[PDB]
Design a protein around this ligand. Structure first.
Ligand SMILES: [K+]
Ligand SMILES: [K+]
Ligand SMILES: [K+]
Ligand SMILES: [K+]
Ligand SMILES: [K+]
Ligand SMILES: [K+]
Ligand SMILES: [K+]
Ligand SMILES: [K+]
Ligand SMILES: [K+]
Ligand SMILES: [K+]
Ligand SMILES: [Mg+2]
Ligand SMILES: [Mg+2]
Length: 1333
RNA sequence: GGGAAUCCCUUCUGCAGCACCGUUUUAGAGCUAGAAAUAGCAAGUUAAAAUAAGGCUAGUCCGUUAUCAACUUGAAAAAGUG
DNA sequence: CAATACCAGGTGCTGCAGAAGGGATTCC
DNA sequence: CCTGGTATTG
């Protein structure tokens, strides 16, 4: 008995099918277990497993880290209170107790209800004197008077609890506060450099202009307008733009060939500046640094909007400014509305439901919503002009706690904290003794390279301690081994050398590593001149001369430099032909040049004695990112370099690791030669063996030692192995489910292994789109966003997203495009989709007319490339198009598409090459094929074939086996069946294809062949004809009978009984909706803390049921508490689950159930299956809701008619065939009614939604004069009524049908519960009516 | 076909460290005319505390991913069953 | 118990490792 | 978005 298995692996489904020799699907009697009439059931061996998507670990991680942050914020406050404890006990022995119980209702409060002072008079006085905390903060910073210790605590605690960000290293307010003085000094430096061309900055109010609440470009334009002989793109204008945060191009200013684009925010700027400074000299450094300072000032002027010479608390002062302007403008607005619009006043100032001031302060209205609500009211009235100015500046009626306070760096809160400590330490000795401690509480961060400060109970931690004691912010450096921890942080993630598994990989920017790469590329260079008979390798001496003369004097070595600066200068060649490198060498000695610039001792770099040292330095620059740790590690080499060189070395840092170890590159030595790998790369006679040849050469010791060095650790489990695969967790869920399905199918066939296994694997964001366009346009310098504003959601339209990625220009014509005309334009594939089935933005382009691309049979023409390459290069540098997009756009100048390229593209359409699919194939192959033959080579009993989806899709369209996904879930199983059929037949017809299609170990000709690989199924081609019976040429075995086999496929797809199984899963994750609801009299509310009665404090509702439980017991009834027998479904919530499982009987008795039949407790996860009358099925949606449990097996004729009539996919083919399909549609129009009838007879039997079915029948009878195509398209929508799973709404034409829900689970308590195996072929059926009698 | 190193680019998976809001209860004396309903006016910007209930291993740790038909054994892990 | 209607925590930043899709040089 | 929880209405 021989059979094959077809598999369709998806993110939410695994389709599976078993076929025999004749491409038939067997059917078996399967035993049925349980307590019902039925002992067995007939099953077709075809089906599909369905499951909810597997989730990434990201949400879990964000919640985990937020949890740790809340814990540590609490700990900061606790440290501060511990410092304050004794002296506060002297001042007020319950202050911290009142703070602790502030949340409690007065009934539950154990102390007086007024937190700060414990009596109403003092509290009211405090609030009258300090309406905001920032008033108190400013007072405590500025005043010289001794202050109440409780107010000191409140100020310091407010600073520490909300401390601000840590984006800026070092200390702050370094005289770079004033924008005027930094602008004046920028002018000073610029005029120092350009004495002949100076700027008159007198009368220019730099302060107001640069700190104004306006866009960067607008402030630049204002300042430039105040300077007559200066333009915004001149040198001074570019410096101001750099200070304002734009991306100016200094190329034109200094006549540079290198495009000197500088943005102060980019990580590359540190190099980007130095590079520029290399060309125009270091005289301009003092200029480009001066502007930098200005930037800082401007940034701080966004946060501090007050003169810093009247107070040492400019932040708190700016908050008080917010408060005062809020008060003044509120008084003014109240008076204005009273005078002019007295009827609206209430709505504006009393209705929390409306987005007025009342909703802004008391309701849920945001600042943005309030501005939107009140802008027309201000425009409508008189005297609102200043208020409107403030509104458009987003500076009207501001609160102090706002979404935009993320700008505030921690250094400013720290300045205020330090000032308060300095003031009050004169009166409180413990503040003086603990000043730096409190400052440390605010400033300290756990470094990202240290991780959780665990003690052996965190699977996420890696930190090691220098001593075993509790870590605090003050003893962190002494207790935590920061060096070992930072080293572990990297080494727990980095790969070892695969060749030498015990050896650490080298840093990517190591000197030795770049030597290895350069020499490995250089040995395979070859050259010819006139007198030479044959191209020659470079000798060792030649390669060393090329390295010393070119690679050690130029960052990049081009082929032209090789030809002229070596072959002409040294070898006196006037002409030479080079191979092995194109345009320029890929490898380079970049670290060598970095270190040559820093240390300025070429002899030091070339001396081998320093090799170790230099390696170590790069290691330190790579392994660590903290400048203090980098400094500590480079201290051993302090004697070798100047302090200046040591500082410049500190600043230089590298990221990334190589793939080979130092021992492999330059450690192990071939036994007879005594030479390392790098030694052979430098010189290897006339063979010039590279790395691969070296380690694979049987005449050398390298291969032997590599084989010897290998180890193998503990073998992964199946699940472990699948988890470690690189891929989406969703597809990995699919992969594991596929393996389990195959195991069960093999067990079904009596442990006989299949002949073949054919596998096919299936193929917010608007925020990323907006980010890409913002970056690209500001990097481009364009004003298209000024003239055409857009929301992220709008960028989901393909044409508009392309429009903005193309800066509003045609991609093939150097012209502007019109937004309002996008519907008239074309979206065109750069490489045609006949060759590359790519529809991403990466292979798409917006143009006025696709005709302007050139010829349609190839890549855009040479003329278009000549026209548009510069514009494309700008788009590439702005990251609005990718490098691949640019290369495909410009391929015509490189010969365009060759015939080999087109043959390749067709092959790619047919042969699967994704790594994850190969991993699935390897898993199945290693599970099936385990025996070895006489030569100890693997015996491949089971051939694992992988197919791409296009094969079976084209098969379905070519032979009219159409699929309509919306009709039911059968199409997954049908896909699996068709995969088995097509794959088995394809390798039977052409066994030579096995290399391509089976796991395990002229361009026109292949193009033709692979384009015509599937023609053997067809009876007529193009207009050649083919036999009825198709056989293998060598064996003579029959592979395809076009008379009988197609009939078999059709019968299989017509079969109504298909095993669709929805994977039952316990629900996990959040306990409930996160929303903290206000107090309410409802037993649905859940306490947020053990003693916070939701009726007094609010809380949560809407918990998730982890799984339900069938309970058969007795509950007390009435005032008499008479025991009454019950059978019911109890939803165990995720939060309740651990308690319920620790002791189910105690949990259930706590809920009210008595005398619980312990053995009759049935665990019922989500999607548990129940069958009732007339084959009607329900799935458990929850403890109190059900889902539809049936599939509508619509006959094949109706499915194919629906596909053809709706113009599902494309009709394509030939116009005569299109006419035949149209004539069939029109000849079978009655099918429409028949289809409806089917749906109706199904819905009345199984769906039971009388109202919705009647509304649907009315809607169908209403649109009977509509075109047939549209009626069919909407009949497709009708199947949502009958689809398996949760009910959902759907539209028939313009009529909307809301979902009918199954809000009661009582009936399943007497129905039949069906437990299904993973395939559903094995069932256990439990008559629940026989329970609770 | 499978694989390696390098260059240009892109995407995705996993981890750590932080910030700003939001919400919730309490505190920030509402006033006057009426017995009340209510009416007229005043006021509003701030804070504390919680932010999965919680756990033991008690750490400035852990608590939302992955994995899960039923039945027989088995504490379980597991294997076995048509 | 029907039909029905609303609701659902959000934003921003820093640092790091890896595999893998596409193109290119050289090899096993 | 989906779809299960919830209050409201009847
Ligand atoms: K889930
Ligand atoms: K009390
Ligand atoms: K000007
Ligand atoms: K609000
Ligand atoms: K190159
Ligand atoms: K580094
Ligand atoms: K020195
Ligand atoms: K789960
Ligand atoms: K209040
Ligand atoms: K199952
Ligand atoms: Mg907590
Ligand atoms: Mg807040």
């Amino acid at each position: 008995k021989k059979y094959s298995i077809g598999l369709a692996i998806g993110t939410n489904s695994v389709g599976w099918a078993v076929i025999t020799d004749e491409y038939k699907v067997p059917s078996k009697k399967f035993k049925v277990l349980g307590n019902t009439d039925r002992h067995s059931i007939k099953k077709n061996l075809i089906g599909a497993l369905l499951f909810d998507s597997g989730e990434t670990a990201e949400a879990t991680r964000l919640k985990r880290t937020a949890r740790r942050r809340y814990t540590r914020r609490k700990n900061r406050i606790c440290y501060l209170q511990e410092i304050f404890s004794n002296e506060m006990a002297k001042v007020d022995d319950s202050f911290f107790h009142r703070l602790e119980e502030s949340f409690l209702v007065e009934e539950d409060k154990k102390h007086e209800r007024h937190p700060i002072f414990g009596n109403i008079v003092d509290e009211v006085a405090y609030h009258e004197k300090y309406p905001t905390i920032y008033h108190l903060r400013k007072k405590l910073v500025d005043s010289t008077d001794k202050a109440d210790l409780r107010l000191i605590y409140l100020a310091l605690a407010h600073m520490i609890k909300f401390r601000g960000h840590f984006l800026i290293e070092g200390d702050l307010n370094p005289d770079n506060s004033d924008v005027d003085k930094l602008f004046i000094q920028l002018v000073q430096t610029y005029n120092q450099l350009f004495e002949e061309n100076p700027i008159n900055a007198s009368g220019v109010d730099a302060k107001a202009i640069l700190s104004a609440r306006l866009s960067k470009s607008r402030r630049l334009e204002n300042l430039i307008a105040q300077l007559p002989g200066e333009k915004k793109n001149g040198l001074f204008g570019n410096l101001i733009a750099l200070s304002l945060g734009l991306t100016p191009n200094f190329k034109s200013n200094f006549d540079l060939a290198e495009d000197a684009k500088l943005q102060l925010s980019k990580d590359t700027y540190d190099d980007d500046l130095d590079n520029l400074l290399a060309q125009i000299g270091d005289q301009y450094a003092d200029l480009f640094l001066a502007a930098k300072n200005l930037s800082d000032a401007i940034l701080l002027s966004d946060i501090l909007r007050v003169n810093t010479e009247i107070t040492k608390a400019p932040l708190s002062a700016s908050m008080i400014k917010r408060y005062d302007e809020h008060h003044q403008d509120l008084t003014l607005l109240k008076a204005l509305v009273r005078q002019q619009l007295p009827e609206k006043y209430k709505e504006i100032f009393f209705d929390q439901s409306k987005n007025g001031y009342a909703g802004y302060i008391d309701g849920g209205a945001s600042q943005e919503e309030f501005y939107k609500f009140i802008k027309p009211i201000l425009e409508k009235m008189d005297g609102t002009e200043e208020l409107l100015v403030k509104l458009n500046r987003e500076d009207l009626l501001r609160k102090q706690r706002t979404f935009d306070n993320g700008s505030i760096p921690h250094q400013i809160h720290l300045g205020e904290l330090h000032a308060i400590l300095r003031r009050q330490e004169d009166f409180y000795p413990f503040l003086k003794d603990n000043r730096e401690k409190i400052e440390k509480i605010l400033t300290f961060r756990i470094p990202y390279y240290v991780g959780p400060l665990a003690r052996g109970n965190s699977r996420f931690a890696w930190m090691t301690r220098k001593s075993e004691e509790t870590i605090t912010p003050w003893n962190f450096e002494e207790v935590v081994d920061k060096g070992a921890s930072a080293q572990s942080f990297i080494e727990r993630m980095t790969n070892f050398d695969k060749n030498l598994p015990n050896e650490k990989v080298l840093p990517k920017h190591s000197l030795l590593y770049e030597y290895f790469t350069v020499y490995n590329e250089l040995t395979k260079v070859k050259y010819v001149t006139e007198g030479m008979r044959k191209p020659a390798f470079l000798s060792g001496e030649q390669k060393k001369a090329i390295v010393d003369l070119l690679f050690k004097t130029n960052r990049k070595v081009t082929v032209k430099q090789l030809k002229e600066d070596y072959f002409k200068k040294i070898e006196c060649f006037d002409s030479v032909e080079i191979s092995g490198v194109e345009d320029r060498f890929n490898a380079s000695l970049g670290t060598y040049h970095d270190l040559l610039k820093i240390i300025k001792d070429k002899d030091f770099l070339d001396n081998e004695e320093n090799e170790d040292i230099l390696e170590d330095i790069v290691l330190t620059l790579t392994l660590f990112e903290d400048r203090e740790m980098i400094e500590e590690r480079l201290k051993t080499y302090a004697h070798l370099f100047d302090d200046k060189v040591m500082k410049q070395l500190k600043r230089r840092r590298y990221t990334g690791w190589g793939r080979l170890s130092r021992k492999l590159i330059n450690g192990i030595r071939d036994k007879q030669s005594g030479k390392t790998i790098l030694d052979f790369l430098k010189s290897d006679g006339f063979a010039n063996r590279n790395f691969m040849q070296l380690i694979h050469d049987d005449s050398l010791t390298f291969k032997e030692d590599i084989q010897k060095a290998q180890v193998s650790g503990q073998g992964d489990s199946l699940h472990e192995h699948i988890a470690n695969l690189a891929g989406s967790p969703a597809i990995k869920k699919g992969i594991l489910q596929t393996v389990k399905v195959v195991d069960e199918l093999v067990k079904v066939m009596g442990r006989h292994k299949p002949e073949n296994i054919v596998i096919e694997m299936a193929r917010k964001n608007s925020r990323e789109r907006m980010k890409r366009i913002e970056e690209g346009i500001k990097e481009l310098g364009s004003q298209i966003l000024k003239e055409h504003p857009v929301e992220n959601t709008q960028l989901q339209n393909e044409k508009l997203y392309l429009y903005y990625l193309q800066n509003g220009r045609d991609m093939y014509v150097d012209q502007e495009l019109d937004i309002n005309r996008l519907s008239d334009y074309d979206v065109d594939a750069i490489v045609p989709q006949s060759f590359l089935k790519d529809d991403s933005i990466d292979n798409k382009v917006l143009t006025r007319s696709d005709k302007n691309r050139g010829k349609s049979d190839n890549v855009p023409s040479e003329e278009v490339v000549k026209k548009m390459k510069n514009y494309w290069r700008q788009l590439l540098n702005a990251k609005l198009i990718t490098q691949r997009k640019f290369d495909n756009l410009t391929k015509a100048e490189r010969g365009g598409l060759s015939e080999l390229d087109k043959a390749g593209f067709i092959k790619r359409q047919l042969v699967e090459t994704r790594q994850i699919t190969k991993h699935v194939a390897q898993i199945l192959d290693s599970r099936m094929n385990t025996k070895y033959d006489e030569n100890d080579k693997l015996i491949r009993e089971v051939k694992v074939i992988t197919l791409k989806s296009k094969l079976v899709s084209d098969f379905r369209k070519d032979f009219q086996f159409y699929k309509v996904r919306e009709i039911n879930n059968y199409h997954h199983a049908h896909d699996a069946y068709l995969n088995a059929v097509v794959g088995t037949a394809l390798i039977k017809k052409y066994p030579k294809l096995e290399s391509e299609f089976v796991y395990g170990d002229k361009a026109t000709a292949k193009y033709f062949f692979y384009s015509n690989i599937m023609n053997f199924f067809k009876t007529e081609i193009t207009i050649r004809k083919r036999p009825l019976i198709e056989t293998n040429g060598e064996t003579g075995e029959i592979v395809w009978d076009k008379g009988r086999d197609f009939a078999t496929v059709r019968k299989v797809l017509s079969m109504p009984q298909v095993n669709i199984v929805k994977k039952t899963e316990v629900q996990t994750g959040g306990f409930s909706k996160e929303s903290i609801l206000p107090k309410r009299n409802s037993d649905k509310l859940i306490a947020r803390k053990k003693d916070w009665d939701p009726k007094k404090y609010g809380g949560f509702d809407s918990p998730t049921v982890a799984y339900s439980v069938l309970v058969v017991a007795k509950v007390e009834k009435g005032k008499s508490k008479k025991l009454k027998s019950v059978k019911e479904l109890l939803g165990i919530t995720i939060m309740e689950r651990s308690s319920f499982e620790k002791n189910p009987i105690d949990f259930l008795e706590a809920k009210g159930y008595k005398e619980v039949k312990k053995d009759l407790i049935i665990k019922l996860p989500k999607y548990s299956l129940f069958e009732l009358e007339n084959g009607r099925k329900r799935m458990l949606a929850s403890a109190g809701e059900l889902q539809k449990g049936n599939e509508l097996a619509l006959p094949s004729k109706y499915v194919n008619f629906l596909y053809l009539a709706s113009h599902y996919e494309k009709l394509k083919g030939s116009p005569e065939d299109n006419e035949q399909k149209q004539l069939f549609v029109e000849q079978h129009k009655h099918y429409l009614d028949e289809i409806i009838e089917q749906i109706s007879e199904f819905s009345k039997r199984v769906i039971l939604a009388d109202a919705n079915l009647d509304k649907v029948l009315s809607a169908y009878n209403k649109h009977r004069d509509k075109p047939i195509r549209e009626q069919a398209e909407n009949i497709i929508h009708l199947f949502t009524l009958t689809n398996l799973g949760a009910p959902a709404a759907f539209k028939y034409f313009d009529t909307t049908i809301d979902r009918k829900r199954y809000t009661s689970t009582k009936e399943v308590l007497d129905a039949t519960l069906i437990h299904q195996s993973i395939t559903g072929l094995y069932e256990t059926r439990i008559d629940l009516s026989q329970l609770g009698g």
